[PDB]
Every structure is written in C-alpha cells, then in structure tokens.
Specification:
This is part of a larger assembly, with 2 copies of chain A (37 residues), 2 copies of chain B, 3 copies of chain C (238 residues) and 2 copies of chain E (280 residues). With 37 residues, chain A is largely without helices or strands. In chain A, 11% of the residues lie in helices and 5% in strands. Chain B has 2 helices and 3 strands; from the N terminus they run βαββα. With 238 residues, chain C is mainly beta. Chain C has a single domain, classed as Jelly Rolls, CATH 2.60.120.20. The longest helix of chain C is centred in the middle third of the chain and has 9 residues. Chain E is mostly beta strands and 280 residues long. Helix content of chain E is 5%, strand content 29%. Chain E is elongated, with a radius of gyration of 27 Å. The chains are: A little secondary structure (37), B alpha+beta (99), C mainly beta (238), E mainly beta (280). At the E-F interface, strand 8 of E face helix 2 and strand 10 of F. Strand 1 of chain A pairs antiparallel with strand 1 of chain E, so a sheet runs across the interface. The complex binds ligand W11 (2 copies). One copy of the ligand Cc1cc(CCCOc2c(C)cc(-c3noc(C(F)(F)F)n3)cc2C)on1 binds next to strand 5, strand 6, strand 7, strand 8 and strand 11 of chain G. One ligand W11 binds next to strand 4, strand 5, strand 6, strand 7 and strand 10 of chain E. Chain D: It comes from Human enterovirus D68. Chain D: Belongs to the picornaviruses polyprotein family. Chain D: This is Genome polyprotein. Chains E, G: Its main location: host cell. Chains E, G: It holds the Pfam family Rhv_5.
C-alpha cells in the first residue's frame, strides 16, 4: 500500500478504467444509420 | 507588525517605520505608496507575515494593512488608502487610485 | 452611536467618526426596476459591484469668499470608471446614489455647509433672457459653482432649499454628510447624457472662519451609484 | 487634508502594520534569503578546544 | 457517455442490409464528429467475444515511465563548475520525454525523481564519493561555492547519497500553483510587453561533499523523472519537426524528408505507387 | 433539420440555413464559476447581456494562395464593446465563447476550411532559436495568418489538429461552422491581457476554386463571450 | 477560542452596508490587539469554499527538518586534533538552523541526529574507515587520546559506523532539566557576578578507530539535527542583523543595506517611488 | 467604557480615564502553583497583600531624542518593599505581574510609545564579540535604555516586537497601558537574583512633539507582582 | 508505528491541528463592528 505519511508518495494508480471517447469523437449537440444531415 | 514604509536614504532606524504627513497646500495629494514585494526587498519584507512567508514559496490569502494616526488630538483629516490589483503602472492620482 | 458610520459598496468603503445620522431622500431606498413598472423590453445588465461603488471626485477648496459648489448626477460620473463606460455604451440607465460629502477642520474653525440633493435642479441665467447653454450646465467631474447661491441660481431661495433631501456640515458638530438617493424621475429609466435627475449642492451659508493657523480646508465628494441597470446597448458615445 | 491648530505639530506620523487573515495558506518550504554566513561565528571553532 | 472499459468491445454478427433511408457508411466530416460507422454496418461480421485488455494505454501507464530529464558531467578536482552545479529545472531538454508530455495540454501529476551518478578518472581506482542534491525553490538563494553556507540546508530539502548506493529517489508532489501543469502556455510571463512568450519550479543544486582528491575525476549526474497519479486533459497533435530550443516551439525541419517542413512523410513515386508491394 | 440553426445571445442573433450541426468543445457547455471552485474572494460582476453577445470582427478575403487565419481569445475581443471595457478595468476575467465562422460561395465553387479551436496554442517561430515576440502574438481584432499551416506554426501538424474541437466549412456542403467553447484553463479565472485560452484557426486545407465568374469570397468571424465574470476591479489598462 | 483548523477559512458572500454605530474597518492599535476587520466587512465578497490545507505550517513540520549543526574536518595520519576531536555541543554555530530555532522562546523536542562522513587523500584510493562517536554528558571525562580508556564507553552511549555505511543515526530524547529548552536566557549561569550572560548538553567526541595509515587523509564529519515531537512557545521577532558569536546576540549589521544596523530594508528613491513599477 | 479602568491589589489602587482596554499576556492570567506542577517540596510562603501590590519606580523623562527604556523583572523589584525582602531571603520565587505604564500630555502633543513585555529578553552588545556584562544587564529600579531600539538591542527588530504581549500609548488616544503577565518560564519557580522572566520595554516609535508650551513629559511605571510564592528560605542575600 | 521500546524514538507527530490565534491576536480582556473604544 503505502508506508509514508503523505499520500502523494504512494505507488502508481493504474485502476482508472473509465472513459468517454465521445467528448473527442462526437462533440456534436444533436446526437444510427440515418443521414447525419 | 510594522511595515518599513519610509525605507529611504536619510531615514535612520525607527524613522523608517513611520510615514510623516503634513498639512498640504494643494488638493488630492499623493502621500506615499507601498511596494507589495514580499520576495524582493521592500517595506513588507521584515514583518512577521513577511519573514515567515519567506520560508515558503507559495502563498494564498488576504492580507490586511492597519494604519494608526499618531498626530495630536486636535489634528484632523481624512485619507484614502487604495489597493490596486496588478495589470498596469502604479496610480499617481487619486482619480485613478480611487477606482 | 449615530455619530459613527461605515458605508460599504462593492470594493469601496468609507467611515466617519463625526457623522450626523444620515438622510434617506423622501424616506425611500434604492431598488431595481420591478417588472410591473418596466418599459424597455430588452433584458438589462446589472453590473452590481463594478458600478455600484464609491467614486471620489476632485476636491474643492473652501475659501472665505466661496459661494458654493454643485455637481449634477449622473453627468458628474458619466466619464468615470465602469459606471461611465456603461453609460456611454447604453441608451438607457437607472440608479440610486449614495452621497457622502466630507469636510474636516479644527475645533477652532467655524463654518456651516448646506448639503442638499436637488431633484431636477433646472438652472437659470442671471440678468438675461437667454437660457443657459450646454457648457453652463454640463461640467462633468469638476462640477460648477453658484453665482447667486442666495436664490440657488434659479430665482427661488436657499432659505427654503431644506424642503429637499439634505444635511449640514457644521464644523463644530460633524465633518461629513450622507444622503441616500433613490431613483427620482417620471420615467423608469432615462438617457444619461442629456438629463440630470439630481444635483448635489454644497453651499457655505456660514463662511469658514478661525483665528488659528491658516490652512487649506478642502471639501470632498464621493458618490456611489446604487442598483444600476442599463438597457439599449449600442456603441459608445464617447 | 491634514488640518491642525497653531499649537499642534503640523507634521504628523502614521505607522503602518500588516498581517495575514485566517484564510491565508503557505506552501513549499525553502531556506529564507534573509540570513547568511561567510565565516565561522566567533567561538564556533573554540567549541572544539 | 462515460463508462468503464476494461477490454476492447466485442463484435456482433450482422446480417444482409437493404434499408431505405438508412445509410450508416455515409457521414459528414464537416460536423467535426468522427465517422460513427460500425464494422457491423459496413460488412457482414461474425460474433467475437473480444478479451483484449486496454491497460497498457491507460494514461497512468503511457506516461508512467522514468525518463531522463537532466544530464550533467563536471570536473571533480582542485579548481585553483567548481565541484558542483546548479540546474534550472525544466522538462524540455530531452526530446523523448518532452514529446510525450506535449501530447497533452494540461497534466496533473506527482513526480518520482531518481538520481544516477557515475565517475571516471582523468587508473588507481574509483572513489565512492558522497553527493548532495539540494532542491532550491524559486526565490531561494543558490549555492555560490562547493562549501558555501547554503548547503547547510536548514529548510530546503537535500538528499545525500553515495555513488556505491542505489540511485537516490524521492517523490516531488504535484506542486503547481494551479490545478494542473500547463504543458503549453499561449501567454507571457510578465505584466510588461518585453516579457518571455510561452512557458518556474526552481533549481536543483548538486555538489560533491568530499573535498577534492589529489587527482581529477569526471562526475556525471543523470536525473530521471516518472510521473504518477496522473490526470491529463486536451490531447494535441504530436511534434513532427525536430526540436530547436527548450524555451519555445520554434521549428525548422530536417534537411530532407521525412520530417522536413516541406514534407512530413517521405516521398513515393506517385499516388498509385505501392512502396513495399509484394512481388510474388 | 440540423442544417438550419439560430443562435441568440443578448441583443444579437445569427441564423444559418446551411450548417453542419454544431460542436460543443469536449462535450462541455459554458457555466458560471461555482463557489467550490472559486479563488478570488471579491464579489464578481456578471454583466450578462452587455458582454455575452456576438461581436463580429473584420472579414478576411479567401484567396487562391491563402495560408490561413487565426484569432486569439480573449485578445481578439479585449478592445471591443463592453466586453473589452470590463477586460480593461478588471484584473481577472472568465468566460466561455460561442464561435461562428461564416463563408458562402457558389454551387460552382469548391474549397474546404478547417475551423478549429486550439486550447493554449503556443506559437513557434520559423528557422530561428528566438522565441516569438509580443507583436508576433498579440494581433487583436485583426488576427494573424499562418506561415506554415502544414505544421500549425508550432512544429506539429494540421493533419492531427482534428484532435481539437472543430468543424469544417466545405463549400458544397455548408457555409458556416459553430463551436461552443467552455472556460478552458488550469485556473478558475485569468488575467485577460497576457494569456489566451483559445486560438481560433481557419485554414484552407483545400484551396478555393471555380471556373465561374470570379468574385471576392470573404470569411467572417463572429464571437460571443458566454457567462462572463470579472474580478479585481481597478482603473483601466487601456 | 481554541479549535481544530485543517484548512484556510471560507469566505461568505457579503452585502452592501450602511449601518450607524457599526464601523468594522475602524480599530485601535493601542489595545495591543490586531485588527479584527473581516474581508466580508471591508468589501463585498462572494462565497468561497476554501480547501487550502494548512499542514506545511504546522510547527512540527516548520522545524521538522534535518539541519547542519556541526562540521569538523581533521587530519587522519601519524601525529608524531590527533585523529579525533571533541565538540562542545551547541545549536548556535550555523545560521540557518539557529534563526529558525530563535523564532521561538521555548522549545520542547526530541532530536534526531544524523552523522555524515567524508574523506579525501592528501591518489591510491579511499579507505573505508570505522569511526566512533561518543556522547560524553556534562561532568564526564572526555578522551585525551585517540586510544585512551575513555573510548571503552562502558556507560556513555557510543555509535560505531563505517564510511561506506549510510550516515549513522539515533534519537536524542528531549533532555532538558526543565519542561522545555530555553532558546533564549535573560540570565546568568552562576551565583557569582562574573558569570556568563545568556545561555550545557555535553561533548560529542569523534575518533577514527583505525590506527593511522602510511599516508594522510582529511576526514570531515557533518552532524545534522532534526527536531521532532515538537512543542513551541512565545514566537519572537526574527533575526535581521548578521550573527557575530555563538555565545551571544551581539550585532553589528551589514556594511550596506539591506540589514545594516541603520536600515534593515534597502532604500528606494522616495516614499512615492514604486521600485518595480510596470511600464506598459 | 473600556477607556476607564481601576486596578486594585492589596493596599494599592490605580485608575485611568484614558485606557485602551488591557492586555492579558497570551490570554493567560496569574495563578498559584498547583500540586501537579510543583517541584520544591518545602511548604511555600504566600505573602499575598504584602507582596502582591503596586510598586511605582522612579519616572523617566520623555525627550525629543529619547531611544527608549527598559526594566527587567524581577530585578527591577528585587530591592523594593516586602517583595524585595522575600526575594532576598528565599532561593526560589514565582509570580505574575500586573504592569501599568502611564504617560499623559496635552491634546496638542503627539507621540506614540510601544509598551511591550518581552519574555526572556536576552540583550546583545553592539559591534563586539564580548557578551554583555553583569552591570550591563542588572540595572534594578532605575532600569536601562536602548542603544539601538530599531533592533531591540538584540539584532532582531522592533517592527516585529508586536508578536509579544503589548499595548501602545498614543498621546491623542490614551495615557496609559496595562499588561497582565502570568508566570513565564520553563520551570515552576526560579532563583530571582540571576534570571529575569520578563523585560518591560517602553520605546518611542513616534517621537514626542508639539508647538505649544514646552513642559517635562514623564513616563511612569508601576508594577504589581501577583500570586507570589517563595520557597527555599535562608538568610538574606542583600 | 514504532518498533523501538522508547516512545521518543518514534517518527514525527504531524497531527496537532488545533490552534488558538487569539492568544497572540486578541489578548485583550474585553472581547463585531462596534467601536473598540
Ligand atoms: C511543467 C512541469 C513541471 C514539472 C515538475 C518537475 C519537478 O522536478 C524537479 C524537482 C522539483 C525536484 C528535483 C529534485 N531532485 O532532487 C531533489 C531533492 F533534493 F529534493 F531530493 N529534488 C528534480 C526535478 C527534476 O513537471 N512538468
Ligand atoms: C538548546 C538545545 C539543546 C538541544 C539538544 C541538542 C542535542 O544534540 C547533541 C546530542 C545530545 C548528542 C549527539 C550525538 N551525536 O552522536 C551521539 C551518540 F553517540 F550518542 F550516538 N549523540 C549530537 C548532538 C548534536 O537542542 N536545543
């Protein structure tokens, strides 16, 4: 875990598996195979 | 603690700790300004807040300046003390400082 | 405990240790324009702290032969700070005012100033049929002086000027006067560049006197707009 | 203006003080630039004698 | 929108399609959105339970590697860099680390620092010297000499290590005055116009505490940095032109492709020429 | 129905009949600074309608050999209308931006503009070790142009610029691009005169072409600050 | 009055004020109390949930740093300081530590001592010598020679360490005969008038246990102290004039400002002169 | 109502009609030594009224060029009244102190004195490596004066002296200062003849000035030990 | 924690978050915005 008193001294944090690609791939307001226009 | 506002040549010892103001002949007169340098040597450096802060690198928070008038009881007057957030040159007229 | 007072608006504050209570014009207090009194339909801008704060004008020197001074609102402030900017960029404005006139001397000095806020103070010219001109009226920050304070430069009388919101600065008693002015007009808003709701007049009814060391005795005016609202945005009429 | 009568000093002094409020915070400790040393202080070496 | 992804998405079997008004393969790049055509809609697919993990591309891991940020060699001898050096900390001197950091606009992370030391004679053997690395924050006084008072390090953090010990190591917390480090800064450092455009941590001062020996040695100090507890924002176009300065993004490009200002990708005879075409 | 769009802020409105939906940078939307993220303790001024409105800059002419244009925010607006005034009178500012780039031509014209909002676009100088100067960076309303758009004048590449919030104006498809930018910074507020959060870049990846009657094809930029807040009031740094 | 503070205090939104008899910005310095004007009373404020921690300024941390308290180098050779030295312990020899300790009147703390050793030839290689640091309390006999009986250390505490090992380290308990150490003492040491004004722990005796080699070496011992489990009382005005002696607070001041007896702060042209004024 | 104050201890009392509230060093108040903090096992003598009373030292003249004065406790009183007797006959003592510095002038006079109680004020000599001597430190009732008040004669600074329990005597405001000092030491008791717990320093930060009739303006110090206890009785070390 | 038998050998004590500034800032006996005099 961590034997130091300061939490920032701890080892790496490799458990953040959440993600939201859409903020980069689909930043459009109006959200299938229908014409995008 | 006391700011050494009168850090000028000719002012020795405690003379440097007091700012002398006299009866003016003109209006809206500028009396003095205070460099807010805590890192660079200045009126605020040798103060409790100044000295201790210099043992650190980052600071955050409000400061407070208190001025005590030490003239005679029969002496009267009104002064305006202005704090100007950074951005430009130090104001030299009351019309500007007042903002 | 009514001789001591602190006024705080926005990033500005004023204290006085020799006040005389303070006046609320017609017992009113500034407020924003309610929907049931509104006319201009565009959504207004309410700057708050950037405009509702104390602005201190250049001081004047109270002399033995002074006749009095005056400043018209909002003209006096139409070119100062963010208040002035909003005024120049908007067709319509609205606001109350917190007026604080200050003047200190010595316990060996005597003098009494009538500090009155006159609504719609329409000036008159002396000994001529020609109406006052633009420059006779619009003085800006500098303000003007009275030619015949005895009749308030309008053919009436300073004796009855007390009918208007006022206070006095009687040197042996106090060193400042404070008057809170609400919006005063027949319309909910107005065009700031061609009409002045209030006129601040400071007249020495009792001349300044003393037998002690002579020194310059200034009179300073600080005015803080209150509950400012602006409508009709466009370019600036600088 | 500063107004005083004939028997009062016509030049007065102000003393300015400064302090931090309780919303203050300091970080990243370092050595103060306000103190230094060029040689041994008197008696420092005699401590070994 | 947001969700936990631990493996690559599976594929579902798809059938034949002939629907009017439905054209999944058609898109509009102008919207700024990336094509949302799924493989299942472009061709007939089978079902695939994809178990490929996505751990190695976690930002924490992508940036979570110790990289060289500083390298300095000096002469350890009688100087009658005088047995110590002062380094104004920056992360723009070595391209490998620099380019990865610059793949992001903002980065928040704690920094694990590792200091590796080596020595060489100018042969009678290698001395096991003691060194002192002192972190002198912005505004503090930097050592003027190998033995000046500054080294008593009363408040500054110092680490003493021997050449025979494993590399020295400690963690520097995320220390920005902001919520994150600005990998890029489209602004100036001061209130005046003469200020510096773009891009202060402080100075790392390293000295040999041992007095000089009768002979000279060359001592080299390598400092490595490994970010951890990482949070990153706004990915950016990767650097292509060779770097020129640690103080800016100035560019010139290679003399000949690839990566010349004129052409990033090397040339091929024509747009119908297949470079490594299989000649069966 | 996503090719038609109307934007309305304050006393300004814009419509387009050939849009391409519209981009919300990083899927975010502008908002005022919440108490739990605030730093400056003085009460801020939120002008709303007088600052949160569309400001249209001078147009540029799209030519056959154009390399591209850019405008830095808030620099481009630091001297326009009430937004500019607040910026000059306050030490700190904060705001999102609604960007609308417009360019129309003929059904016989072809051309494609990449319209991208680059956060912290730190420019680089070409073939020199000397960092860009103040005048190289601060262009104001006029904005600047790209010297080497191929690498976004910073040693990277326009090819990967799509990683940033953007849209395109492809003449055969649409005649405008719209990008909504939230506050983008590592601090809740900033000093507007020495740092630009966003840079609007309009680059012609596909040159303008046609065989019909030749005419001047302009590109116009309209920007509307959103949720403006200002702190640290003082005099104006004009 | 007393309370637990873990973060900087929050700010509450404040409204317009115009109350008679209420003047928060007015104070009376003569009372000896510091102004109690709150920001909310001086200007209009917004609400701010301040999450700034206040850990780094905890006294335990402010003073909790290993600082150099002693440094001595001597000749290790055949003396036909004879291969050992005796140091009368004190914490007034190095200004960085001294000034911080002197920010308080009284201090109670346990002391962590770390001993760092380095050697240099007067080149055939550096010897991995063994040293002995012996704490000789007040009243005990101090070693007369490198090999005198005193070193058998039957009751004194001694620590033997090699130059190749990590610095030696142990904790000295708070050992005053009082509840706290007197950083300052406005009194005399004895009952007679000829006594010493102002300001005994004992002697730290360090020797090289190895017999001398055929050649000479210079050995330097650096001792560091880190107070812990700290309690402090009555803060004091910080030192401004350079130190002169370890035995007193005598002062003289620099030759020229800053910190000259005549002027602590450097001069500026006048009280209306802004030193680093922004010239836009 | 905090400008008026009466102090009464034993057969002595003092009143002031121009006080500035009063200081309780470190917010503490004098008290007798509790059993759980005691060290000396002999039953102590608690004289009460014969020692816990106001003792007034000889006054000093405040001059235009004065540098300041100081009195060390308990040295200043070690030879006065029954307090002095107990001190001379006992090896150990313990007590708090009620300090009252008084100085009046005219409403035409100006001047400001910093009145601070410094714990363990260890003096330093000027421009020499030789430590101060016995006579440099032990002045008794007469007390001493500052050579370099600017640095409190110890290489620090008067500017930060406010960190210590204090008050000021600003002539236009008040004419006296009052400080209540609790026992201050690392030991429950001490030998009174070779160690001073507190040092009373009165320094004129703002020199005495006036343009009226010149007259001698004295400064007087009255000190009252509190909760006195004495242990280790023997003959007197006169 | 601490493996030595003497408690003073333990590591630092960085948990004393209590404080009372008033003993230095307001050492006056008689405690808003009312005149301090
Ligand atoms: C931008 C940006 C800024 C940073 C922070 C880099 C911090 O790294 C430094 C610091 C602060 C300290 C040391 C350091 N080396 O030694 C020590 C010790 F002495 F304190 F241990 N500190 C080394 C580097 C490279 O990362 N990206
Ligand atoms: C005043 C004042 C007094 C102190 C106490 C300082 C104690 O430090 C000493 C002591 C007592 C022991 C050693 C010491 N070094 O080595 C050994 C060992 F041999 F016992 F391990 N003890 C070193 C110093 C500086 O702190 N402030």
């Amino acid at each position: 875990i961590n034997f130091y008193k300061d939490s920032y001294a701890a080892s790496a944090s490799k458990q953040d598996f959440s993600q939201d690609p859409s903020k980069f791939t689909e930043p459009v307001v109006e959200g299938a195979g229908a014409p995008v226009l | 603690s006391m700011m050494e506002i009168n850090n000028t040549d000719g002012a020795n010892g405690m003379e440097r700790l007091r700012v002398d103001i006299s009866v003016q002949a003109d209006l809206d007169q500028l009396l003095f300004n205070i460099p807010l340098d805590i890192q660079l040597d200045g009126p605020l450096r040798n103060t409790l807040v100044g000295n201790i802060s210099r043992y650190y690198t980052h600071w955050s928070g409000s400061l407070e300046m208190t001025f005590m008038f030490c003239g005679s009881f029969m002496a009267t007057g009104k002064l305006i003390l202005c704090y100007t957030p950074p951005g430009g040159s130090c104001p030299t007229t009351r019309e500007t400082a007042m903002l | 405990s009514d001789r001591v007072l602190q006024l705080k608006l926005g990033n500005s504050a004023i204290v006085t240790q020799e006040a005389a209570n303070y006046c609320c014009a017609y017992g009113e207090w500034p407020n924003y324009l309610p929907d049931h009194e509104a006319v201009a339909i565009d959504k207004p801008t309410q700057p708050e702290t950037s405009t509702d704060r104390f602005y201190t004008l250049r001081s004047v020197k109270w002399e033995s032969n002074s006749t009095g001074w005056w400043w018209k609102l909002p003209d006096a402030l139409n070119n100062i700070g963010m208040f002035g900017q909003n005024v120049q960029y908007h067709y319509l404005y609205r606001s109350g005012f917190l007026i604080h006139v200050q003047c200190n001397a010595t316990k060996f000095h005597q003098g009494a100033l009538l500090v009155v806020a006159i609504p719609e103070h329409q000036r008159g010219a002396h000994d001529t049929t020609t109406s006052p001109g633009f420059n006779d009226i619009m003085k800006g920050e500098r303000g003007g002086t009275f030619n015949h304070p005895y009749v308030l430069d309008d053919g009436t009388s300073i004796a009855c000027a007390t009918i208007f919101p006022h206070q006095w600065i009687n040197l042996r008693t106090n060193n400042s006067a404070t008057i809170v002015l609400p919006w005063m007009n027949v319309a909910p808003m107005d065009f700031p560049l061609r009409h002045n709701q209030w006129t601040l007049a400071v007249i020495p009814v009792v001349p300044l006197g003393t037998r002690t060391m002579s020194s310059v005795v200034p009179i300073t005016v600080s005015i803080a707009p209150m509950c400012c609202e602006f409508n009709g945005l466009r370019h600036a009429i600088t | 203006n500063l107004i005083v009568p004939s028997e009062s000093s016509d030049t007065c002094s102000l003393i300015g003080f400064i302090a931090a409020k309780d919303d203050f915070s300091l970080r990243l400790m370092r050595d103060s630039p306000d103190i230094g040393q060029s040689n041994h202080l008197h008696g420092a070496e005699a401590a070994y004698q | 929108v947001e969700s936990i992804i631990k493996t690559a998405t599976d594929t579902v079997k798809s059938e034949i399609n002939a629907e009017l008004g439905v054209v999944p393969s058609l898109n509009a790049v102008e919207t700024g959105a990336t094509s949302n055509t799924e493989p299942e809609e472009a061709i007939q697919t089978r079902t695939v339970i994809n178990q490929h993990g996505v751990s190695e591309t976690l930002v924490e891991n992508f940036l979570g590697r110790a990289a060289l940020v500083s390298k300095k060699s000096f002469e350890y001898k009688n100087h009658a860099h005088k047995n110590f050096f002062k380094w104004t900390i920056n992360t723009k001197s070595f391209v490998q680390l620099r380019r990865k950091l610059e793949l992001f606009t903002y980065l928040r992370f704690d920094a694990e620092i590792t200091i590796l030391t080596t020595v060489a004679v100018n042969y009678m053997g290698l001395p096991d010297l003691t060194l002192q690395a002192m972190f002198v924050p912005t505004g503090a006084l930097t050592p003027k000499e190998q033995d000046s008072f500054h080294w008593q390090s009363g408040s500054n953090a110092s680490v003493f290590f021997k050449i025979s010990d494993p590399p020295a190591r400690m963690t520097i917390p995320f220390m920005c005055i902001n919520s994150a480090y600005s990998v890029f800064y489209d602004g100036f450092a001061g209130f005046e116009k003469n200020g510096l455009y773009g891009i202060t941590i402080g100075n790392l001062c390293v000295r040999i505490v041992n007095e000089h020996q009768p002979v000279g040695f060359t001592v080299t100090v390598r400092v490595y940095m490994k970010p951890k507890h990482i949070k990153a924002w706004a990915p950016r176009p990767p650097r292509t032109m060779p770097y020129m300065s640690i103080a800016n993004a100035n560019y010139k490009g290679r003399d000949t492709a690839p990566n010349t200002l004129n052409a990033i990708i090397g040339n091929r005879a024509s747009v119908t020429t297949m470079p490594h075409n299989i000649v069966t």
